[PDB]
Every structure is written in structure tokens, then in C-alpha cells.
Design an enzyme around this catalytic site. Structure first.
Site, PDB file in Angstrom:
ATOM      1  N   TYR A 146      -1.255  -0.815  11.124  1.00  0.00           N
ATOM      2  CA  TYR A 146      -1.535  -1.411   9.827  1.00  0.00           C
ATOM      3  C   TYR A 146      -0.469  -1.048   8.799  1.00  0.00           C
ATOM      4  O   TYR A 146       0.149  -1.926   8.197  1.00  0.00           O
ATOM      5  CB  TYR A 146      -2.886  -0.954   9.278  1.00  0.00           C
ATOM      6  CG  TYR A 146      -3.002  -1.225   7.791  1.00  0.00           C
ATOM      7  CD1 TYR A 146      -2.914  -2.529   7.296  1.00  0.00           C
ATOM      8  CD2 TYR A 146      -3.135  -0.180   6.874  1.00  0.00           C
ATOM      9  CE1 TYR A 146      -2.947  -2.787   5.935  1.00  0.00           C
ATOM     10  CE2 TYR A 146      -3.172  -0.434   5.494  1.00  0.00           C
ATOM     11  CZ  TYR A 146      -3.075  -1.743   5.040  1.00  0.00           C
ATOM     12  OH  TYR A 146      -3.101  -2.025   3.693  1.00  0.00           O
ATOM     13  N   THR A 205       0.766  -1.235   0.000  1.00  0.00           N
ATOM     14  CA  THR A 205       0.000   0.000   0.000  1.00  0.00           C
ATOM     15  C   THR A 205       0.802   1.293   0.000  1.00  0.00           C
ATOM     16  O   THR A 205       1.974   1.325   0.383  1.00  0.00           O
ATOM     17  CB  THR A 205      -0.926   0.002   1.233  1.00  0.00           C
ATOM     18  OG1 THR A 205      -1.611   1.254   1.336  1.00  0.00           O
ATOM     19  CG2 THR A 205      -0.107  -0.223   2.493  1.00  0.00           C
ATOM     20  N   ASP A 206       0.146   2.371  -0.412  1.00  0.00           N
ATOM     21  CA  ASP A 206       0.790   3.673  -0.442  1.00  0.00           C
ATOM     22  C   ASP A 206       0.917   4.224   0.973  1.00  0.00           C
ATOM     23  O   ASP A 206       1.632   5.198   1.199  1.00  0.00           O
ATOM     24  CB  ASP A 206      -0.001   4.650  -1.329  1.00  0.00           C
ATOM     25  CG  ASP A 206      -1.409   4.909  -0.818  1.00  0.00           C
ATOM     26  OD1 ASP A 206      -1.851   4.205   0.113  1.00  0.00           O
ATOM     27  OD2 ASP A 206      -2.082   5.819  -1.355  1.00  0.00           O
ATOM     28  N   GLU A 207       0.239   3.595   1.931  1.00  0.00           N
ATOM     29  CA  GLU A 207       0.305   4.064   3.313  1.00  0.00           C
ATOM     30  C   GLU A 207       1.696   3.931   3.927  1.00  0.00           C
ATOM     31  O   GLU A 207       1.995   4.569   4.933  1.00  0.00           O
ATOM     32  CB  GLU A 207      -0.711   3.327   4.197  1.00  0.00           C
ATOM     33  CG  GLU A 207      -2.159   3.506   3.768  1.00  0.00           C
ATOM     34  CD  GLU A 207      -3.157   3.176   4.873  1.00  0.00           C
ATOM     35  OE1 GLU A 207      -4.357   3.061   4.564  1.00  0.00           O
ATOM     36  OE2 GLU A 207      -2.752   3.043   6.050  1.00  0.00           O
ATOM     37  N   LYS A 244       2.733  -3.294   7.199  1.00  0.00           N
ATOM     38  CA  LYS A 244       2.822  -3.454   5.746  1.00  0.00           C
ATOM     39  C   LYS A 244       4.220  -2.995   5.304  1.00  0.00           C
ATOM     40  O   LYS A 244       4.914  -3.703   4.570  1.00  0.00           O
ATOM     41  CB  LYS A 244       1.766  -2.607   5.026  1.00  0.00           C
ATOM     42  CG  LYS A 244       0.343  -3.156   5.123  1.00  0.00           C
ATOM     43  CD  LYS A 244       0.244  -4.553   4.537  1.00  0.00           C
ATOM     44  CE  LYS A 244       0.602  -4.560   3.048  1.00  0.00           C
ATOM     45  NZ  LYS A 244       0.433  -5.910   2.437  1.00  0.00           N
TER      46      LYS A 244
HETATM   47  N1  LIG Z   1      -8.145  -1.860   0.317  1.00  0.00           N
HETATM   48  C1  LIG Z   1      -7.259  -1.180  -0.439  1.00  0.00           C
HETATM   49  O1  LIG Z   1      -7.516  -0.130  -1.077  1.00  0.00           O
HETATM   50  C2  LIG Z   1      -5.800  -1.625  -0.590  1.00  0.00           C
HETATM   51  C3  LIG Z   1      -5.095  -0.637  -1.486  1.00  0.00           C
HETATM   52  C4  LIG Z   1      -3.594  -0.997  -1.652  1.00  0.00           C
HETATM   53  C5  LIG Z   1      -2.969  -2.053  -1.123  1.00  0.00           C
HETATM   54  N2  LIG Z   1      -3.800  -2.945  -0.337  1.00  0.00           N
HETATM   55  C6  LIG Z   1      -3.307  -4.278   0.060  1.00  0.00           C
HETATM   56  O2  LIG Z   1      -3.944  -5.207  -0.760  1.00  0.00           O
HETATM   57  C7  LIG Z   1      -4.025  -6.479  -0.076  1.00  0.00           C
HETATM   58  C8  LIG Z   1      -5.491  -6.919  -0.048  1.00  0.00           C
HETATM   59  O3  LIG Z   1      -6.267  -5.833   0.515  1.00  0.00           O
HETATM   60  P1  LIG Z   1      -7.823  -6.003   0.731  1.00  0.00           P
HETATM   61  O4  LIG Z   1      -8.489  -4.709   0.737  1.00  0.00           O
HETATM   62  O5  LIG Z   1      -8.392  -6.849  -0.373  1.00  0.00           O
HETATM   63  O6  LIG Z   1      -8.045  -6.702   2.149  1.00  0.00           O
HETATM   64  P2  LIG Z   1      -9.272  -7.473   2.715  1.00  0.00           P
HETATM   65  O7  LIG Z   1      -9.518  -7.059   4.124  1.00  0.00           O
HETATM   66  O8  LIG Z   1     -10.502  -7.198   1.875  1.00  0.00           O
HETATM   67  O9  LIG Z   1      -8.948  -9.023   2.610  1.00  0.00           O
HETATM   68  C9  LIG Z   1      -7.812  -9.600   3.276  1.00  0.00           C
HETATM   69  C10 LIG Z   1      -7.866 -11.071   2.924  1.00  0.00           C
HETATM   70  O10 LIG Z   1      -6.717 -11.796   3.489  1.00  0.00           O
HETATM   71  C11 LIG Z   1      -7.176 -12.864   4.259  1.00  0.00           C
HETATM   72  N3  LIG Z   1      -6.277 -13.047   5.389  1.00  0.00           N
HETATM   73  C12 LIG Z   1      -6.071 -12.297   6.520  1.00  0.00           C
HETATM   74  N4  LIG Z   1      -5.133 -12.828   7.342  1.00  0.00           N
HETATM   75  C13 LIG Z   1      -4.721 -13.982   6.677  1.00  0.00           C
HETATM   76  C14 LIG Z   1      -3.763 -14.980   7.004  1.00  0.00           C
HETATM   77  N5  LIG Z   1      -3.040 -14.944   8.130  1.00  0.00           N
HETATM   78  N6  LIG Z   1      -3.589 -16.025   6.107  1.00  0.00           N
HETATM   79  C15 LIG Z   1      -4.345 -16.043   4.951  1.00  0.00           C
HETATM   80  N7  LIG Z   1      -5.252 -15.172   4.565  1.00  0.00           N
HETATM   81  C16 LIG Z   1      -5.402 -14.140   5.485  1.00  0.00           C
HETATM   82  C17 LIG Z   1      -8.609 -12.508   4.675  1.00  0.00           C
HETATM   83  O11 LIG Z   1      -9.356 -13.712   4.988  1.00  0.00           O
HETATM   84  C18 LIG Z   1      -9.148 -11.760   3.440  1.00  0.00           C
HETATM   85  O12 LIG Z   1      -9.750 -12.560   2.394  1.00  0.00           O
HETATM   86  C19 LIG Z   1      -3.398  -6.227   1.305  1.00  0.00           C
HETATM   87  O13 LIG Z   1      -2.077  -6.736   1.472  1.00  0.00           O
HETATM   88  C20 LIG Z   1      -3.539  -4.708   1.458  1.00  0.00           C
HETATM   89  O14 LIG Z   1      -2.551  -4.221   2.389  1.00  0.00           O
HETATM   90  C21 LIG Z   1      -5.157  -2.788   0.017  1.00  0.00           C
HETATM   91  C1  LIG Z   2     -14.709   3.630   7.404  1.00  0.00           C
HETATM   92  C2  LIG Z   2     -14.799   5.137   7.281  1.00  0.00           C
HETATM   93  C3  LIG Z   2     -13.630   5.924   6.769  1.00  0.00           C
HETATM   94  N1  LIG Z   2     -13.667   7.300   6.641  1.00  0.00           N
HETATM   95  C4  LIG Z   2     -12.498   8.022   6.115  1.00  0.00           C
HETATM   96  C5  LIG Z   2     -11.152   7.769   6.781  1.00  0.00           C
HETATM   97  C6  LIG Z   2     -10.141   7.834   5.597  1.00  0.00           C
HETATM   98  O1  LIG Z   2      -9.589   9.132   5.395  1.00  0.00           O
HETATM   99  C7  LIG Z   2     -11.019   7.509   4.394  1.00  0.00           C
HETATM  100  C8  LIG Z   2     -10.883   6.080   3.888  1.00  0.00           C
HETATM  101  O2  LIG Z   2     -10.846   5.181   5.038  1.00  0.00           O
HETATM  102  P1  LIG Z   2     -10.683   3.598   4.847  1.00  0.00           P
HETATM  103  O3  LIG Z   2     -11.691   2.972   3.976  1.00  0.00           O
HETATM  104  O4  LIG Z   2     -10.641   2.975   6.174  1.00  0.00           O
HETATM  105  O5  LIG Z   2      -9.307   3.492   4.020  1.00  0.00           O
HETATM  106  P2  LIG Z   2      -7.849   3.952   4.331  1.00  0.00           P
HETATM  107  O6  LIG Z   2      -7.559   4.097   5.757  1.00  0.00           O
HETATM  108  O7  LIG Z   2      -7.644   5.203   3.568  1.00  0.00           O
HETATM  109  O8  LIG Z   2      -6.968   2.695   3.799  1.00  0.00           O
HETATM  110  C9  LIG Z   2      -7.380   1.931   2.664  1.00  0.00           C
HETATM  111  O9  LIG Z   2      -6.483   2.253   1.570  1.00  0.00           O
HETATM  112  C10 LIG Z   2      -5.081   1.838   1.812  1.00  0.00           C
HETATM  113  C11 LIG Z   2      -4.231   2.288   0.610  1.00  0.00           C
HETATM  114  O10 LIG Z   2      -4.337   3.740   0.433  1.00  0.00           O
HETATM  115  C12 LIG Z   2      -5.007   0.311   2.064  1.00  0.00           C
HETATM  116  O11 LIG Z   2      -3.654  -0.068   2.328  1.00  0.00           O
HETATM  117  C13 LIG Z   2      -5.924  -0.071   3.225  1.00  0.00           C
HETATM  118  O12 LIG Z   2      -5.834  -1.505   3.428  1.00  0.00           O
HETATM  119  C14 LIG Z   2      -7.354   0.399   2.895  1.00  0.00           C
HETATM  120  O13 LIG Z   2      -8.211   0.005   3.996  1.00  0.00           O
HETATM  121  O14 LIG Z   2     -12.400   7.669   4.793  1.00  0.00           O
HETATM  122  C15 LIG Z   2     -14.821   8.021   7.000  1.00  0.00           C
HETATM  123  O15 LIG Z   2     -14.901   9.234   6.903  1.00  0.00           O
HETATM  124  N2  LIG Z   2     -15.905   7.260   7.476  1.00  0.00           N
HETATM  125  C16 LIG Z   2     -15.996   5.856   7.650  1.00  0.00           C
HETATM  126  O16 LIG Z   2     -17.031   5.382   8.075  1.00  0.00           O
END
Ligand SMILES: NC(=O)c1ccc[n+]([C@@H]2O[C@H](COP(=O)([O-])OP(=O)(O)OC[C@H]3O[C@@H](n4cnc5c(N)ncnc54)[C@H](O)[C@@H]3O)[C@@H](O)[C@H]2O)c1
Ligand SMILES: Cc1cn([C@H]2C[C@H](O)[C@@H](COP(=O)(O)OP(=O)(O)O[C@H]3O[C@H](CO)[C@@H](O)[C@H](O)[C@H]3O)O2)c(=O)[nH]c1=O
Ligand SMILES: NC(=O)c1ccc[n+]([C@@H]2O[C@H](COP(=O)([O-])OP(=O)(O)OC[C@H]3O[C@@H](n4cnc5c(N)ncnc54)[C@H](O)[C@@H]3O)[C@@H](O)[C@H]2O)c1
Ligand SMILES: Cc1cn([C@H]2C[C@H](O)[C@@H](COP(=O)(O)OP(=O)(O)O[C@H]3O[C@H](CO)[C@@H](O)[C@H](O)[C@H]3O)O2)c(=O)[nH]c1=O
Lengths: 347, 346
Positions: free
Chosen positions: B159, B123-125, B163
Site C-alpha cells: 500500500y 500519505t505519511d506512510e 502510494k
Molecule cells: N485514511 C487515511 O487516514 C488517509 C490519510 C492520508 C492519506 N490518505 C490517502 O487519501 C486518499 C483517500 O483515502 P481514503 O481513506 O478516503 O480511502 P477509501 O478507502 O476510504 O476510499 C478510496 C476511494 O477510491 C475509490 N477507488 C478505488 N480504486 C479506484 C479506481 N481505480 N478508480 C476510481 N476510484 C477508485 C473507492 O471506490 C473509494 O471511494 C488515498 O489516496 C489515501 O492514500 C488516506
Molecule cells: C483495523 C485495525 C488496526 N489496528 C492498528 C494497526 C495500526 O497501527 C493502527 C491503525 O490501522 P489502520 O486503520 O489500518 O491505519 P494505518 O495502517 O495506520 O493507515 C491509515 O493511515 C495512513 C496515513 O497514516 C493512510 O495512508 C492509510 O490509507 C490509512 O488506512 O491500528 C488495530 O489495532 N486493530 C484493528 O482492528
């Protein structure tokens, strides 16, 4: 001292024991509890002289949450030195590095968070990766980015440096997310009394005393920034008591030297031929040059290193290992035998 | 150039979308999903496409014995598995330490043992955050005003730090052991199958459930939105054409503050512009994220296709609307969990 009951993890090791001795001799109002697992690197003899009412040695793992919680509950600060610290061991088996350096730090951070106590993370300059030699830099090492600073990008090369950098990262995150009162220090290569014979300088010195030839990785062009452990101790103390929460401070004494140059000095000081040594298998992913710009620590905390004369510091170090052979003699064979498994005399 | 890949976390949001992508566009590739099925894993995300092309193995990536068994039959590992929610990491970081770091380490050793391709999805985080455009001399377009492959790591939470820590050992394993690894750091994904604890899905489904959307503070925070479909092609490009040891940033140049995203959602769903609650802000909340994806575009020719956020969001809203049975069983639990740490600001 504002902290009267501190915990020093890894306090039975090289740099940590030096720190505990520093505290014992310079801050009598401080009670110290050392939490050390006594791995191959931990040595009670490093603390024996000062063990008593002022310093207690508790044998345990920093990853032991129950033990850490019991100790943390009675402390007002944690100075964390505990770690697997040898690059060569990490390349051979990363397991203990993952456990101790990352999980261990995490365990300590949660205790610090729970009791809301001061926390100082002791780290290395290796988290920044390596730098080119001065002769290959446009500024000859004096230009921006030609030395490590608090703003340098993390870019660890090995399991050891990567797990340390990883620990550094969660420490900073715990500060921002939970308000943990932590500071971080990244320092250069420490040398001096009580360093394990697996490390560079002590290995060459004791090898010579034991009738064994010194070992130089590759051509020994690699550069390290040497600092006497005594200056590292005062640096950590300054950061612990006056550092800004959440800040990282680099500790160095401006003592860059290549391994070859250092080894030759040891041979010379110990009355040995210049070529009385062996070139051996170079280390995988070996970092080229390390250099620390300690301006922040000097300028902001008023800290200054006292042991800037390397030749003299090395002389005293050689003398120490000479007058304390009983301290390491029983480990020599095992250490060299372990190295023989991956190191051979090359050209 | 791979026939038997393991996709960890393939039952999750981004991972399952990647699996669907491979299933559709590369039917000659066999995919073995290794997913632990935590609160975030969902079989429904894969059920329709399970078969000869895709199989699901329930397990932990930290389970060395299981990983070894699967790695022995694969030619590549695409690693999505992770605890991905900042808010959950603040409440209980233990699973993040375990899955994100130990899990990654476990997979790296397997990749090292069998000498197979490994792509680390990150992630970009890991870069921390940036000031708002209004507070930058280049208004966000100047040097250092966006994340690049040269930006230093500076994670703000359990988190993002776990990462970042995993990114670091991945690179160290490349330099020290020659592991064939690549890394990608992506901006905020959105689209079908995203868990309702996340920002966009949460607001959408709350409205559908008759619950008020929730905005952290006043919603000044900026996120760079990218449709998961574009993330999938990005990872595929890196997996098949990337240079070993390199890190690639994935982004579609879609910065938006939370407030305007919520308003667009309200508007598109026929709700009053002010029909939402301001709620407790997130501790250590990252201000702005912004990705400069020039490297990926230049070197691999990757080009995002879903750059129209308004259209992407509309379709996403429609998906959660057409698939309410997919998330209804979780609404109550997710909102109840949030209530323990968040309340309406007033
Ligand atoms: N949500 C985003 O925008 C986002 C953006 C950039 C990078 N990422 C990265 O992309 C990847 C996937 O993100 P996501 O949003 O789909 O997450 P998610 O929460 O939707 O899903 C995580 C998945 O991993 C599985 N998991 C958790 N712990 C595990 C373990 N110990 N062994 C096996 N499986 C396990 C869960 O069961 C689930 O299916 C992550 O590594 C995350 O850091 C997420
Ligand atoms: C859940 C929730 C979130 N927010 C805000 C907080 C954040 O600035 C923004 C997005 O929050 P989130 O959906 O939790 O996403 P964020 O923290 O940005 O991180 C996401 O994006 C990341 C990459 O940028 C991934 O690595 C993470 O796994 C993914 O969860 O919205 C709200 O205002 N209200 C809400 O109810
Ligand atoms: N040697 C150097 O030049 C140097 C320079 C800069 C930073 N550092 C850092 O300074 C600290 C101390 O370094 P060192 O050279 O004295 O190391 P060392 O090898 O001499 O000692 C490490 C100590 O930690 C203990 N230990 C290991 N795992 C443990 C665990 N799980 N629980 C409790 N104790 C455990 C060992 O028993 C030993 O006493 C480390 O964190 C290291 O990364 C070292
Ligand atoms: C043991 C040994 C080492 N060397 C070389 C390799 C290195 O460039 C240099 C010093 O090696 P080491 O003593 O292992 O130290 P180094 O890898 O630089 O790292 C040390 O210093 C780091 C901080 O700079 C600490 O974080 C580490 O924990 C500590 O072990 O000497 C040899 O040439 N021959 C040897 O026999």
C-alpha cells in the site's frame, strides 16, 4: 555458486548480456535462463556465442505472469536487468516504462514470493535525482551528501528514473512485508562493448565511424560517473551471493567526468578535430551531476573495480565498435532519425 | 480559483469529506466525482449533496478514455482515488498496483494533455516509520524524530510503496513535463464516513454490534491523528495557494498509541477497560508515524481546528452511533474477512 539455475531478465541487453557472459566464464556450475522481450534494445547477437546447454534464451515479457511462473518454478534466483532504460525515450513515450519497469518488476516479485527464491533488483543511481557540480559544493564533492550513498533520498527527475525508483520501492516493501529475499544495486553510468547506439558514448563513437557528427546536449557540463560494465557484473555477483537481505548497494568506480570532456577524448582518440561535433537541444529536466560513493559495497563485500583507467577502457570500447560495425550499422539511420524528431543543432 | 474540478475517489472517506467541504464553503465551484465504487466507495457518502454543484461519475481512473472525456471539461484534478488499506494490500496487492500507480499515471497524462492543475493526495506512510518517543534522544521533538518534507521515502508495504511510487512519478512529471502538480502527505485521518475496516471505526462499530474491539499485538504502535475536516482545508489551501512542484505534510500533532486510543473509546462508550481482544499483529507493521507540518503552517497559514482528540473522538463515536444503518450491512462481511487472517491471541 550457491545458485545453480538462475533467470536473468533483460539478459539480451547491454549490461545484462555482459553479466550472462560473466557468469558463463566465471561460474560454470550455473545454468542461465535469459528472459528477454527483444525490444529495439534487445539483441540475440549479444548472447549468440554462449547460447546452448548452459544458457537458454526465452523470448517473452517480464509482465507475462504465466511465462514468469513457468520459469520461476525451475529457478533458484532471479537477477533482474529487464527495463526500458533510455531517458530520452521515456520523455517521448513513458508508456513502456510504466509497463516494463514497474508492472514488470511487480510481476517478478510475486513469482519470487510464490517460490521463495533469491531476487536481485538491478537499478540506477538516477533514482536519487542529481547533484550540483563539484565547483559549487562546499566539500568539492568529498563532503557528506556530495555523492550518492545508500542513505540518499530518492528524487527521480524523469519517467525513466521515476519508474525505476518506483520499482526499487516495491522491492523493499516486498522484503519487509513478505520476507522476499531481495537485494538492490544502484550503479553509475555503464560503458563498454554491446551498448546500444542510442546511448551517449556509443552514439558518438559510431556516429564518427558512420561519417556523422557527434551530438552534445547543451554545453555538456553535465557530469556522469563512468564504470565499465565488467565491474558492474562482478559487483552484482558479489551482492547476489553475499549481500545482506533487504540491503541496497551502490556500484561505482569513482570515474566522474563531464560529457564535453568525454566527447573530446573520443574525438581525440579517433583522430578528429576538437570542434568536429554539434551542440544540440538539451534534454528536458536533464540531471546535472551523478556521483557514487561505493564504500558499502567495497567495505562490506570486499568488491573492487578493475577497470579504473577510463582512457584505456574508452580506447578498448572505441576499438570494439570499430571491429564490430556489422553489429550496429543497420540501426544507425533509424536511431539518428528518431533523435532528429526532437533534437536540432543549436548554436 | 477553479470552477470545474474533478475529485477522484470522492465517494470514499477523505474524498467525500472534501466534496462536502467544497459543497458547503465554495458553492460556486462545480465538482465532478470520478469514483469506481469499490468495496470502499459509497454513494450514501454523496447522495444528499448530489446536484448542480456535485455530480457522480462511476468509473476507473485507469480508464484513459473516460478520464480524457472528463479532463477535457475540468480546470483541476484533486486525486484521492486509491486502495487505502494496508491489511488488504498484504492479502492481495494487485488492485493497489493498478489503482495507486497506473491510475495516478493515467491522471497525470490527462493533466499533461490539457495542462490543468493536479493535486496529489498522499500519505505519511511513504516515509516508512519512526522509533517510539521513549527511544529517541529528543523524545520525538528532535531533528529527524518526525517526518518532514526532507525525509526520505522508505515505504514498508504494498500500500505505502504504491502510494510512494505514485508520489515519485507526480514529481517527475513536474520536472520533465511542467505539469502543474502539488503533493500532500497526510497523517491518519478519522471522522464520519470512514470505512469500518479502519482502526477507529472498527472498534466503535464492533462495540455497537456487540463484538469485541480488536488490538494488534499489545498496541504499542503510534499514529498521528487528524480530523478529516482539517485535512480538507489543508488540501484546499494547497490546491489554491500552493507552489507548483512542492510537497506539503499535513498533520495536527496528535500522536497516540493504539492501546490508549482503544481505551479512550472503551471508556467513552461505557465499556470495561479490558473488554477487547489482542489479535494477530500486522506483518511489517509500521511502528510510529509523526508529522512536522511546519511548512504548510508557515507558508500557507493553514491551522488545524480540531486539535482536541477527546472531543473529536466523542463526536465520531456519536456519528457512528447515530448512523448505524450506514455501516451495519458491512459489519459481518468485514469481520468475516479479517477472520481469514486474524485470530485472538492467547
Ligand atoms: N485514511 C487515511 O487516514 C488517509 C490519510 C492520508 C492519506 N490518505 C490517502 O487519501 C486518499 C483517500 O483515502 P481514503 O481513506 O478516503 O480511502 P477509501 O478507502 O476510504 O476510499 C478510496 C476511494 O477510491 C475509490 N477507488 C478505488 N480504486 C479506484 C479506481 N481505480 N478508480 C476510481 N476510484 C477508485 C473507492 O471506490 C473509494 O471511494 C488515498 O489516496 C489515501 O492514500 C488516506
Ligand atoms: C483495523 C485495525 C488496526 N489496528 C492498528 C494497526 C495500526 O497501527 C493502527 C491503525 O490501522 P489502520 O486503520 O489500518 O491505519 P494505518 O495502517 O495506520 O493507515 C491509515 O493511515 C495512513 C496515513 O497514516 C493512510 O495512508 C492509510 O490509507 C490509512 O488506512 O491500528 C488495530 O489495532 N486493530 C484493528 O482492528
Ligand atoms: N545503461 C546504464 O548505464 C545502466 C546503469 C545502471 C543501471 N542500469 C539498469 O541496468 C538494467 C539494464 O540496463 P541496460 O543498459 O543494459 O538496458 P538495455 O536498453 O541495453 O536493455 C534492456 C533489455 O531489457 C529487455 N526488455 C525491455 N522490456 C522488457 C520486458 N517487458 N520484458 C523482458 N525484457 C524486456 C530489452 O529487450 C533489452 O534486452 C536496467 O534495469 C537499467 O535501468 C542501466
Ligand atoms: C545520447 C546522448 C547523451 N548525451 C548526454 C546526456 C547525459 O548527460 C549523458 C549520458 O546520456 P545517456 O547515455 O542517455 O545516459 P544517462 O541519461 O546518463 O543514463 C544512463 O545511465 C543511468 C545510470 O547512471 C541508467 O539508469 C540509464 O538507464 C542509462 O541510460 O550524455 C549527449 O550529450 N548526447 C547524446 O547524443
Amino acid at each position: 555458486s550457491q545458485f545453480k539455475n538462475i533467470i536473468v531478465t533483460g539478459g539480451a541487453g547491454f549490461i545484462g548480456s555482459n553479466f550472462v557472459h560473466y557468469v558463463y566464464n566465471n561460474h560454470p556450475d550455473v545454468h542461465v535462463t535469459v528472459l528477454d522481450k527483444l525490444t529495439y534494445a534487445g539483441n540475440k547477437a549479444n548472447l549468440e556465442a554462449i547460447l546452448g546447454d548452459r544458457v537458454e534464451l526465452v523470448v517473452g515479457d517480464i509482465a507475462d505472469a504465466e511465462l514468469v511462473d513457468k520459469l520461476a518454478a525451475k529457478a533458484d534466483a532471479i537477477v533482474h536487468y529487464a527495463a526500458e532504460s533510455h531517458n530520452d525515450n521515456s520523455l517521448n513515450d513513458p508508456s513502456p516504462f510504466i509497463h516494463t519497469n514497474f508492472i514488470g518488476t511487480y510481476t517478478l516479485l510475486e513469482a519470487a514470493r510464490k517460490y521463495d527464491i533469491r531476487f536481485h533488483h538491478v537499478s540506477t543511481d538516477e533514482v536519487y535525482g542529481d547533484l550540483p557540480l563539484r565547483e559549487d559544493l562546499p566539500g568539492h564533492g568529498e563532503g557528506p551528501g556530495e555523492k550518492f550513498t545508500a542513505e540518499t533520498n530518492y528524487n527521480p527527475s524523469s519517467p525513466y528514473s521515476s519508474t525505476k525508483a518506483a520499482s526499487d520501492l516495491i522491492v523493499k516493501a516486498w522484503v519487509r512485508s513478505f520476507g522476499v529475499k531481495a537485494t538492490i544495486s544502484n550503479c553509475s553510468n555503464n560503458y563498454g562493448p554491446y551498448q546500444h547506439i542510442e546511448k551517449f558514448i556509443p552514439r558518438q563513437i559510431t556516429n564518427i565511424l558512420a561519417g556523422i557528427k557527434p551530438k552534445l546536449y547543451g554545453e555538456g557540463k553535465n557530469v556522469r560517473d563512468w564504470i565499465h560494465t565488467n565491474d558492474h557484473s562482478t559487483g552484482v555477483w558479489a551482492i547476489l551471493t553475499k549481500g545482506r537481505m533487504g540491503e541496497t548497494y551502490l556500484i561505482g568506480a569513482d570515474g566522474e567526468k563531464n560529457n564535453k570532456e568525454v566527447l573530446e577524448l573520443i574525438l581525440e582518440k579517433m583522430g578528429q578535430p576538437k570542434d568536429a561535433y554539434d551542440h544540440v537541444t538539451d534534454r528536458a529536466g536533464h540531471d546535472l551531476r551523478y556521483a557514487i560513493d561505493a564504500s558499502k559495497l567495497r567495505d562490506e563485500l570486499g568488491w573492487t573495480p578493475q577497470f579504473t583507467d577510463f582512457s584505456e577502457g574508452l580506447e578498448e570500447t572505441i576499438q570494439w565498435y570499430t571491429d564490430n560495425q556489422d553489429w550496429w550499422k543497420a540501426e544507425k539511420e533509424a536511431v539518428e532519425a528518431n533523435y532528429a524528431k526532437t533534437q536540432e543543432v543549436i548554436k
